[PDB]
Amino acid sequence: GIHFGNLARVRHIITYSLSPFEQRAIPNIFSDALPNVWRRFSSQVFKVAPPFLGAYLLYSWGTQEFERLKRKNPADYEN
Amino acid sequence: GRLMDRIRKWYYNAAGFNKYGLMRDDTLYEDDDVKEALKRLPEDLYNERMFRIKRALDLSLKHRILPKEQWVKYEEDKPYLEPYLKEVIRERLEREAWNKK
Amino acid sequence: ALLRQAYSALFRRTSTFALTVVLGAVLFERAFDQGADAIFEHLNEGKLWKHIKHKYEAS
Amino acid sequence: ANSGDFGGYYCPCHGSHYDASGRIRKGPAPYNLEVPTYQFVGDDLVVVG
Amino acid sequence: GELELHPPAFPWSHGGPLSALDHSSVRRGFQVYKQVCSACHSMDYVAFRNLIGVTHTEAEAKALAEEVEVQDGPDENGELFMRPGKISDYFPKPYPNPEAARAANNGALPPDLSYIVNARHGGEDYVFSLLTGYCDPPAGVVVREGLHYNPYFPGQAIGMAPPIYNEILEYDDGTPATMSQIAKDVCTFLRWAAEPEHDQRKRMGLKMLLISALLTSLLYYMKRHKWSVLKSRKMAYRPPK
Amino acid sequence: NLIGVTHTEAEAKALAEEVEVQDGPDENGELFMRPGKISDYFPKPYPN
Amino acid sequence: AAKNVVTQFISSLSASADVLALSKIEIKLSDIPEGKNVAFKWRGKPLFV
Amino acid sequence: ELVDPLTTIREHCEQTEKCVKARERLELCDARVSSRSHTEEQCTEELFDFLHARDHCVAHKLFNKLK
Amino acid sequence: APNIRKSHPLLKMINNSLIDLPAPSNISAWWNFGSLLAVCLMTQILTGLLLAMHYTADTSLAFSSVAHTCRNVQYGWLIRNLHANGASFFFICIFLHIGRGLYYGSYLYKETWNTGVILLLTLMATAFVGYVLPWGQMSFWGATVITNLFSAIPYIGHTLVEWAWGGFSVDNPTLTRFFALHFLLPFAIAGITIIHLTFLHESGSNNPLGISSDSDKIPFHPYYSFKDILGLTLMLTPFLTLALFSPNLLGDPENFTPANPLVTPPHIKPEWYFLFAYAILRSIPNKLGGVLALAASVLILFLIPFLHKSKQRTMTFRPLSQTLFWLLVANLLILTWIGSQPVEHPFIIIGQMASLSYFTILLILFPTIGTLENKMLNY
Numbered sequence A: 001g002i003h004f005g006n007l008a009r010v011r012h013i014i015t016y017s018l019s020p021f022e023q024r025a026i027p028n029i030f031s032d033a034l035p036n037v038w039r040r041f042s043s044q045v046f047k048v049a050p051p052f053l054g055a056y057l058l059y060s061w062g063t064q065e066f067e068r069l070k071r072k073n074p075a076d077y078e079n
Numbered sequence B: 001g002r003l004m005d006r007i008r009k010w011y012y013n014a015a016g017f018n019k020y021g022l023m024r025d026d027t028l029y030e031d032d033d034v035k036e037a038l039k040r041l042p043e044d045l046y047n048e049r050m051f052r053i054k055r056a057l058d059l060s061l062k063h064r065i066l067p068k069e070q071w072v073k074y075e076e077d078k079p080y081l082e083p084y085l086k087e088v089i090r091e092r093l094e095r096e097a098w099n100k101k
Numbered sequence C: 001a002l003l004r005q006a007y008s009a010l011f012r013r014t015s016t017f018a019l020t021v022v023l024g025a026v027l028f029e030r031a032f033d034q035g036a037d038a039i040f041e042h043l044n045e046g047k048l049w050k051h052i053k054h055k056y057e058a059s
Numbered sequence D: 001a002n003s004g005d006f007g008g009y010y011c012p013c014h015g016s017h018y019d020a021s022g023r024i025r026k027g028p029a030p031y032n033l034e035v036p037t038y039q040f041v042g043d044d045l046v047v048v049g
Numbered sequence E: 001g002e003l004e005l006h007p008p009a010f011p012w013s014h015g016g017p018l019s020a021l022d023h024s025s026v027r028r029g030f031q032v033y034k035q036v037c038s039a040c041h042s043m044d045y046v047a048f049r050n051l052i053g054v055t056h057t058e059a060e061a062k063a064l065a066e067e068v069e070v071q072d073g074p075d076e077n078g079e080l081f082m083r084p085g086k087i088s089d090y091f092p093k094p095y096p097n098p099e100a101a102r103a104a105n106n107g108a109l110p111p112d113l114s115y116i117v118n119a120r121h122g123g124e125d126y127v128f129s130l131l132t133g134y135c136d137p138p139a140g141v142v143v144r145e146g147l148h149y150n151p152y153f154p155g156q157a158i159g160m161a162p163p164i165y166n167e168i169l170e171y172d173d174g175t176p177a178t179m180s181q182i183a184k185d186v187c188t189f190l191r192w193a194a195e196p197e198h199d200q201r202k203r204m205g206l207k208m209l210l211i212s213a214l215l216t217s218l219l220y221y222m223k224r225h226k227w228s229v230l231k232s233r234k235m236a237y238r239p240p241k
Numbered sequence F: 001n002l003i004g005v006t007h008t009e010a011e012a013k014a015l016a017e018e019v020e021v022q023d024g025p026d027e028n029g030e031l032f033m034r035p036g037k038i039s040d041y042f043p044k045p046y047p048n
Numbered sequence G: 001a002a003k004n005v006v007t008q009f010i011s012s013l014s015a016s017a018d019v020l021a022l023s024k025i026e027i028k029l030s031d032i033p034e035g036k037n038v039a040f041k042w043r044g045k046p047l048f049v
Numbered sequence H: 001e002l003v004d005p006l007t008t009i010r011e012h013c014e015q016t017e018k019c020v021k022a023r024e025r026l027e028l029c030d031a032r033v034s035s036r037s038h039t040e041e042q043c044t045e046e047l048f049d050f051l052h053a054r055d056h057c058v059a060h061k062l063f064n065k066l067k
Numbered sequence I: 001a002p003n004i005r006k007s008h009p010l011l012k013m014i015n016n017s018l019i020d021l022p023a024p025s026n027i028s029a030w031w032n033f034g035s036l037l038a039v040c041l042m043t044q045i046l047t048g049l050l051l052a053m054h055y056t057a058d059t060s061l062a063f064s065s066v067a068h069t070c071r072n073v074q075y076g077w078l079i080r081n082l083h084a085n086g087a088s089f090f091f092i093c094i095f096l097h098i099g100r101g102l103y104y105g106s107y108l109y110k111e112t113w114n115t116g117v118i119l120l121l122t123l124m125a126t127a128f129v130g131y132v133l134p135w136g137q138m139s140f141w142g143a144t145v146i147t148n149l150f151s152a153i154p155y156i157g158h159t160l161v162e163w164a165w166g167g168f169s170v171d172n173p174t175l176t177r178f179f180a181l182h183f184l185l186p187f188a189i190a191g192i193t194i195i196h197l198t199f200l201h202e203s204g205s206n207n208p209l210g211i212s213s214d215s216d217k218i219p220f221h222p223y224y225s226f227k228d229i230l231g232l233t234l235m236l237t238p239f240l241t242l243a244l245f246s247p248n249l250l251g252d253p254e255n256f257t258p259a260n261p262l263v264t265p266p267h268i269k270p271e272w273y274f275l276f277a278y279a280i281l282r283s284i285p286n287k288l289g290g291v292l293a294l295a296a297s298v299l300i301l302f303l304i305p306f307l308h309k310s311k312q313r314t315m316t317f318r319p320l321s322q323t324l325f326w327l328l329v330a331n332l333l334i335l336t337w338i339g340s341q342p343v344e345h346p347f348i349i350i351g352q353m354a355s356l357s358y359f360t361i362l363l364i365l366f367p368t369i370g371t372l373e374n375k376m377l378n379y
């Protein structure tokens, strides 16, 4: 059952942390937060958007095309 | 030729594992062969790989990456495990061929 | 200092904290429920049977 | 009844087109609509079953 | 044929997520259903008691109830028999079974309106457009004998004749009984009929959103707080020299 | 239920038809009588 | 023992005995004018004429 | 005696740009179909385009006039 | 002894899986669905029991009993809504859960993944029979179609259909056995979910970076208990907004018409969460193929593990794989769209493409691009 203590062998790593009460829950909302939100957004939009944007069109086309084929062709009764 | 040689440098930057401070070898998935390799690693190399990883995990939880100035450069990437891994797999293949023999 | 007084007198002791949550909900409930309905009934004046009512009621 | 492209029938579930004979003409359906055992026992009165 | 006219979107006073039904108009619609539609349409899931506190006073409802003779029994001799209506009874079925109904409507079967707006895409927008959208067939279109033209109905040849027209009844509240006015009231009624909870459903939604906001916020702060320990955590590799 | 226990299929069918059964509604939504089927249950002497 | 218990239980799923097996149906070919199809309830699922 | 605001506005709407052209397109269809004997066409489409444009308009203010 | 949190035969378990459970320090929001899925299961079961208390498994009463539940039973309408919409959020969540798994190579945890597939499949069947209970037009014909799928099996098949219906056509015997089946399955789901988490705990959660996190684990509590609660509240808003404001949004209005054994509605479409598969099956203009395609469209999940060629575990550092991934997501989004459209042009051909597309990205492109990417890493 118990896993904490076996996990892995680690040496020479020091860490420093502060009580949740000595710091801010959401700090540097502008100087740090948002800037990264953008960073991340930026770096993934060209990977994600393409296939979706693509399908999007396929939708509109297929939709419009199906609808076009609804309308009547006057050339069928000009006789 | 020097085609995939620059292709490689491109991919290396595209992959992006260096923005975390990891070497190509750090990101290797730990199957049997790799775990065996990791075992043979001299201590310094092993302790270093650990820290690199632990730092990357901290970066991930933080949703941050290293400053562009600390990203590993394609040509400075050390394949510290690659060779060990080769041997390990080499060693295994032999046993295998031998046992079917 | 509310935060100090509050902490010192409500949030510190696990008991007083619990009682404060009970007491809290109570007051919060009344307040919320009334105001919520108020907001709803206002946004819907003369449309509720509450409003129409009197026309077929008693006197 | 009276739908599809074979003046027969059209199944709205997966697009099977049947003709006026109830035969499968287009779509995923494997066979033609079933024919029951009947007999024209009248002038304008038929009995099935 | 393979072409159909979808209805427009009228601004019903209850269309909005926080917009209740106009009970006055629902009261009206009832009358329209009672005095006009009920002659061929059953509303099996509603009872006179349902009106109480919504559109009518208890007395009014009881009254409306008694106006109908209901079949009960068996009695002591095992006989069925009539009796006045109780607020507990449901709205009277115009026919004892579809076969009979169809029989009295050219083989056409008037559907039960209890859940009508939800049984049709468009709901009141569709029901409304249909009731008023009656008209003559376009060139080349022959409407089989018995069926009437209505572009909004799928196939355009419906079996129901225009149920309403100006002054087909008289709203005892003094509202001008114009055909569309009627359609607007009965449609509003058909919405309440399909979902009385409608109003409360929405009042809850309001409370829900408020609490959901207050609470999602307080919990975002709480999640962050605890996690700060890790977010700001700094580390370093100080190997031996 | 009689069939193959106490009576032959024919016998059962026969016994069945000896009873008028109320069915429907019909095309006008009318109830009506009809002979018995082996599928019918034994006739209730009273409606309630 | 097993084969029999499974057999029995497995068949408790199959159609029951109240699942009859009914007769015909008469139809006046006059109710069905030329150029039209009509459905009639029968043996469960529809029946076209 | 009375006037259904529905008609009042249906008229006003048919004055509208689209309706007019739709109405016209329809009249044209009707005409040739109503004439040409033993034909195969219909004017559903035009009637719909017309209706669609008309009623869309109708449904935009009709309720203001209703109670 | 010392503490009763680690010693007690029962608490030792709650503590062993929801308190002291070691978890990667970096798992993201894409790891919140596991519990949401769990919460859905609980929520469904609970509202379900509540509803089952007022239901009546009988063709002549089913439809109206549900009506009575909504119209007469206090808050019956709310409960039915939460149950109907819960079903959807169950699928929404399960779908994202599956996605995350594919993107981050969680499937490398074979037993956890496999059982996961069983869960999806069971959830599917569960939701199916459940939908058949109000006994509206859709309920009836859906029942008719889905059960009929098995007729595709050679020789036997039909014989299996008989069972499914308890007759020679959908009817009461079917409705009552379906109500039973629907009442039962949720629990087989909850049960299997225990096996799921059990196999998972053998290895512990995987993480975005796809590299060992032993160098940085954290107690589930308060880190993920807190994260999870937050996650729940986020999913809760839309779910309730939908439930309280637009109740029938995700539902077909055709099912407000009592089942008519003699008339299949002209416009009959599968519940949204089935559309993608529905679409794939319509594409093959052959009975058996379409079925096999359908079967394959879901069963293929079992192969994913044997199609992993990448030397890296996740797609975090595989830009090509990442695109192929999002392509697949849109591919499905397309198939879903198609499912809602009539069997006509250009829809038919588009569907067939997407379908052909789908199986290809999974059976061929992915393993290929993975191999390709390995070479680009000079491996």
Ligand code: HEC
Binding pocket: E032, E033, E036, E037, E038, E039, E040, E041, E105, E108, E109, E110, E111, E116, E120, E127, E153, E157, E158, E159, E160, E161, E163, E164, E186
């Ligand atoms: C004389 C009987 C009669 C009256 C009174 C009548 N209807 Fe109908 N109604 C029918 C018939 C017949 C149909 C079936 C048409 C069909 O499906 O071919 C019908 C169908 C309907 C339908 C639509 C069916 C569909 O498929 O779209 C609605 C909605 C409806 N009626 C509403 C009303 C309302 C509201 C009223 C009162 C304002 C009303 N009806 C009054 C006979 C009537």
Ligand code: HEM
Binding pocket: I030, I031, I032, I033, I034, I035, I036, I037, I038, I041, I094, I097, I098, I101, I104, I105, I106, I107, I109, I112, I113, I114, I115, I116, I117, I119, I120, I123, I189, I193, I196, I197, I200, I204, I205, I206, I207, I301
């Ligand atoms: C009732 C259905 C299911 C429930 C309640 C459920 C629940 C869970 C839970 C609680 C977790 C842990 C937290 C997380 O990583 O999200 C988990 C993990 C996992 N589940 Fe499921 N699951 C279900 C179905 C499935 C399905 C359909 C699949 C995929 C075919 C699956 C595959 C996995 C895998 C691979 C993991 C590993 C997560 C990791 O990468 O660390 N699960 N599941």
Ligand code: HEM
Binding pocket: I041, I044, I045, I046, I047, I048, I049, I050, I051, I052, I053, I055, I066, I080, I083, I084, I087, I090, I123, I126, I127, I128, I130, I131, I132, I133, I134, I182, I183, I184, I185, I186, I187, I189, I251
């Ligand atoms: C795996 C979890 C569950 C899922 C996915 C689920 C899904 C569904 C679905 C889709 C329906 C049709 C909803 C509708 O009316 O539109 C339904 C109906 C129903 N379910 Fe469930 N259900 C679950 C658990 C349960 C359980 C455990 C019970 C009770 C023991 C239950 C009882 C019912 C009842 C009574 C109905 C029929 C009446 C109604 O539609 O509300 N369900 N369920």
Ligand SMILES: C/C=C(C)/C=C/C=C/[C@H](OC)[C@@H](C)[C@@H](OC)[C@@H](C)CCc1oc2c(O)c(OC)cc(OC)c2c(=O)c1C
Binding pocket: D013, D014, I121, I122, I124, I125, I128, I129, I138, I141, I142, I143, I145, I146, I147, I164, I181, I268, I269, I270, I271, I274, I277, I278, I281, I294, I295, I298
């Ligand atoms: C007694 C219990 C039984 C027999 C259980 C059976 C379980 C089977 C599968 O679950 C594993 C199945 C649900 C799953 O297939 C993988 C679905 C994605 C299939 C989706 C599906 O839905 C439809 C539907 O909902 C309809 O009505 C609104 C109508 C339909 O066509 C006319 C369909 C349909 O054509 C398909 C393919």
Ligand code: FES
Binding pocket: D011, D012, D013, D014, D015, D016, D027, D028, D029
């Ligand atoms: S059931 Fe008729 S096309 Fe599939």
